[PDB]
Symmetry: C3
Subunit: 174 residues, 3 copies
Amino acid sequence: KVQELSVYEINELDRHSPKILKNAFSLMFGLGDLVPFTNKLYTGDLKKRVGITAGLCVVIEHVPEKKGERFEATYSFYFGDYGHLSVQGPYLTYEDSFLAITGGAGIFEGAYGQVKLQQLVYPTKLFYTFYLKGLANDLPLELTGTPVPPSKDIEPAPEAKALEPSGVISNYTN
Amino acid sequence: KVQELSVYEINELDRHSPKILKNAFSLMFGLGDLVPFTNKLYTGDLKKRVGITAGLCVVIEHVPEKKGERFEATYSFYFGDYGHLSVQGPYLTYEDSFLAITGGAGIFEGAYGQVKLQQLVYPTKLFYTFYLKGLANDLPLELTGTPVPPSKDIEPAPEAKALEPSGVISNYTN
Amino acid sequence: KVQELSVYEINELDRHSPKILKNAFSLMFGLGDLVPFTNKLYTGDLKKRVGITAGLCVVIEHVPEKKGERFEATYSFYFGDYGHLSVQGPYLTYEDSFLAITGGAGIFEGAYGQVKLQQLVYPTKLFYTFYLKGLANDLPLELTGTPVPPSKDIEPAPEAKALEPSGVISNYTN
């Protein structure tokens, strides 16, 4: 069975990220450019800080027709002591995409399926919906609150941005 | 149940690829050298352009006794509107290898198994056979035409090279 | 059915590894720094050389309060003619972690699950415990011997370090 899990990834610009290694033949982004990154991750209902994303975007090409870039991305999503999910696939700055769920650990051991990536504000706000298969158990209720509908205006709960106990999961990843 | 899917990956020299990021203290490839890449991808029967490969080869070592290199590769195969497959594992310039199928998306959601990489003409032509498990449905017929047996002299159909509708899949990746 | 598999990873200083690609503006590791690496891999009982590890550590952040680093790692474990296992996940220099098994090839085709990483000497000796599902067959007995108790003092069997027939698996990876 599929268990839907939604999360918001927010770049609050306080993690030295993105770091752009610029090597391409072109002034614009192009093959050769690498972007290691790490953003914050919140629950789909925006009530709690869960952890971080972490990994590498490999630039594949500039896409002038779409005024954007194609990256190939390899990264993980960290949920404090619950574990993590890993993914691989396309990040297009100009449109939504789906990535492969390559596996997980902790409660996410056995994870497979795909995840939808929706960019809400370039490059600071993204919304994901994992269509998760393979998990041993139902997801914890803490993570499965009704998601806030995605739009450019979303913000995590103030207590979650503030790292108050009510706004974080235990040992949220940082 | 295994569904075999074969494709040809061709470097037509028009995608700025490969891009070599040099760090090893050697005239030869060595650990430290990174090689982002993206080549064109055609059906196993060579009749249609499907998309591209995209990702990163990490040089592991030069192998003088084999006159070649070992890379560790993490990358995806894009099939236009159908989705993508992702892989991880060894690319040896000097011999065939098997890589892990880490997952997929679109029609390839749930994909697992291994893929055989056959190096046909270095560095411009490779032939792959995915031994695909976990797919929801039989693959579309236009992807499963009897493959052209691999040889150094294979060429995509002229319609596929020229990007005519009869020689491409819908929204073929570029 | 889960099959447990333990192996030792040792940096014997003869593979040019690790290579530190320094891009962060600090003397400390930081986002931007990339570390391609490849170490030797021995059985859990330390009697046999099996192969190598090979891949890339991406620095995510320095963790000064823990006197260590967080990396996001993408790499494979090579077992000679047996095949390989691929992983994605966290490597923290200051505490044990679990990584996702993203897939495998050979006897490891269909592999999934998670793997524990335990550092014994930073960064030259590590001990892993794979929790493997999905395999077609029971693991070969030469890989499932009782592990040597993990400590900073572990050493491969003399025959294995010297690459004598009795101390290696067939076509052990190098």
